[PDB]
Design a protein that fits this description.
This is part of a larger assembly, with chains A (134 residues), B (260 residues) and C (218 residues). Chain B has 260 residues and is α+β, with helices and mostly antiparallel strands. Chain B is built from three helices and 17 strands. The longest helix of chain C is centred in the C-terminal third of the chain and has 37 residues. Classes of the chains: A alpha+beta (134), B alpha+beta (260), C alpha+beta (218). At the B-C interface, loops of B face helix 3 of C. The structure holds two RNA strands. Chain B: It comes from Saccharomyces cerevisiae (strain ATCC 204508 / S288c) (Baker's yeast).
Amino acid sequence: SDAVTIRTRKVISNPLLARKQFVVDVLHPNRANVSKDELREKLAEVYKAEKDAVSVFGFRTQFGGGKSVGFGLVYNSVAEAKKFEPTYRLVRYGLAEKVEKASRQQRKQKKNRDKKIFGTGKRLAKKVARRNAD
Amino acid sequence: ARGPKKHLKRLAAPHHWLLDKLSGCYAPRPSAGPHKLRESLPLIVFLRNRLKYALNGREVKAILMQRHVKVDGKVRTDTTYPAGFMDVITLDATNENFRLVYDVKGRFAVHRITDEEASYKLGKVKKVQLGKKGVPYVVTHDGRTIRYPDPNIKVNDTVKIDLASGKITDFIKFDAGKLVYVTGGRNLGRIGTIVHKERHDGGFDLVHIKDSLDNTFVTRLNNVFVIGEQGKPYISLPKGKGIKLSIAEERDRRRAQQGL
Amino acid sequence: MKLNISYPVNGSQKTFEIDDEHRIRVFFDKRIGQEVDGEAVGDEFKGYVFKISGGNDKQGFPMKQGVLLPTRIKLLLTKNVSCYRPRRDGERKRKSVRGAIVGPDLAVLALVIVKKGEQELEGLTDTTVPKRLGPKRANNIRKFFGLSKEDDVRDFVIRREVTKGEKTYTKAPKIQRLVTPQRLQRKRHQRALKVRNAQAQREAAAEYAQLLAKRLSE
RNA sequence: GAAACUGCGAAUGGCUCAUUAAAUCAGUUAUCGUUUAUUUGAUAGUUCCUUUACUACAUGGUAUAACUGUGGUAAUUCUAGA
RNA sequence: AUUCAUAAUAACUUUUCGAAUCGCAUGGCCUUGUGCUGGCGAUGGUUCAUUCAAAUUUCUGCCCUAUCAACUUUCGAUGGUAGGAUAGUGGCCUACCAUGGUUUCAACGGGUAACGGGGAAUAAGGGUUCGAUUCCGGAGAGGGAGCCUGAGAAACGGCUACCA
């Protein structure tokens, strides 16, 4: 790793969306990669992030090598960043817990399972259980 | 078809929303509100396709849920409510006021006005009629009616209505000398005069509108939209002026502007 | 068959297994909406009077009042109707049903008791089974507890006690249409707005008339 | 917050091109013939009483679901009964 | 360019409403009632108008086939009155009255393994051919028929009955 040059094109500040945004030009000239968490840290130290409420996602690698291009945002207010930004990139960043759920097909199966069943449902279940007994 | 086409097709959407063949499936389906969507210009399209503030609809929806806007006196929480011509957009946490009006290309230009001048707009009267209750009202070009006018007001003229309770103020008639902006078609965007109107009744007269460089063009009556007196625009005017650049002059402007 | 006997003094209902030929007989030739004593059906029933309430046929199809001709029939039924459960708006469907008359073609008939005889029914008439709740509206409670128009029902509420597992607490209905200064203030705003808009348009018309008189002057 | 009652929706869309020879379809039209959930620019001093012994207006009334408990049949987004 | 708008007039109305609707809350003055006053936003409320839907028409325009030259009206075919009747125009339907419509500019009838356009390709050009299927739009859920809520539903993963 000779050096990183992580430059801002189009430095625009939005109080509405509560950030400073730009285009992240990572000259990572021969290093190995782009390494997005180290890049979180650098953009934090250059403007201010305290990395958690940065948002950089799209450092795609140029041909001939050594350059990556993407976008960067630096929100304020870590809880604002939480509210605004999406659980999936949040758990990518690791500051979240991504949940365990069955598949869309499993959930639509459950919907069909449900779709026979009017009313509270215990009233359905209890009487059919008495019946299944006898 | 038992109903409304509840969506919109990409390569059906407005070519003047400045959008791509790429980028997904669909367009916003503007739900209910005043302007006509082909003549409207809604918020995500300004925010994201003319002025570029945010990426996802999720971004723009929580933006509008905190309501960073006023537009002619009220927010709106439809992502693509139909706002439009001569509306007065204001964006508060950023403190930008833009006025809406066509480009020399027919595109609603990015034309900043001041928070003074964020209190009045043109209303191009569609009919000043004798309502019920003896309420004489008059309907205009932004989806409205209003009572107790200056009853000298009459059809095809334009007036200076304020924002939110309205309350008609001074107006601009339609005769030889009214300073013109044009609002539909090829002469769309243009600016000129009323050197004559050919009243072709039954609907849809015509008007010769002459731009400031003495080039003339016949426009539709309801394409015509006077905006003051000659040398007296009631509002501020765009970059381009709707003076109808040829691509020749555009290319000359490119090879002149770019450099030093 | 299977008789489902309902005693509304207790809100009680019970199953019984009617096994005697000559006693299931005497029910023959009767209708829905019809009352008979279960007298020769049982010395225990001797005196008890039931108005026939309904029944589901040997295949489950029900009976229904004015559905005579003692065998099945297919009929188009609707909302606010028995033995057909509509499922969408304007739903109006044909389905089957059994006849309104007595026959051996139910597994199950239900009767509701009318008058009580000399003996007692071990499981059914004995119990005392509740309305698990009481009402909710201010008026309903005023009437449910015998109060005046101004008796301030708020404390009269018989409130559901609940232990969490041990932690005990109380809750209760949301008495709707109970008078509040909020209701007052909003009706007051209504009256305000009424007269105020009247007077605003009155003055605007006055201005317009003044302008007209001016124009006439000119 | 299981769930109901109801608001609403389910009238989406997606694939075919049977018929069909001015029908569907396209437009430049144009309704001073015409319905319009939905959204909002507007958008609501009159209510009842032959005008003194007047009507809950602190707002008046029951009727039931989901709910408890009693059902079926070889069998069902079936269905009796308090 | 309306007998348009416009509304009143005097009557009539199984009388329609005009909210027996919601939450945060809690200010003010004393005549100390719990007085009256009182904000923000939740849902309904009549009409227009708009937006989102909706209908027909002026007007136009589709291969070949004449081995289809005569078409059209029995029972609406053309039209009028009057009625009924639609979201309204109207034989949409009904009684009474009249004989009607087009066209050698190709009607009517038949076929179409017939949705067309924008497109595919050639390619000076000129011109031609195919276009079910993702843009414009449409008709459709076996074949009929009949059937509610809605503003729009003959819907069909919403319905009655028959046929297979």
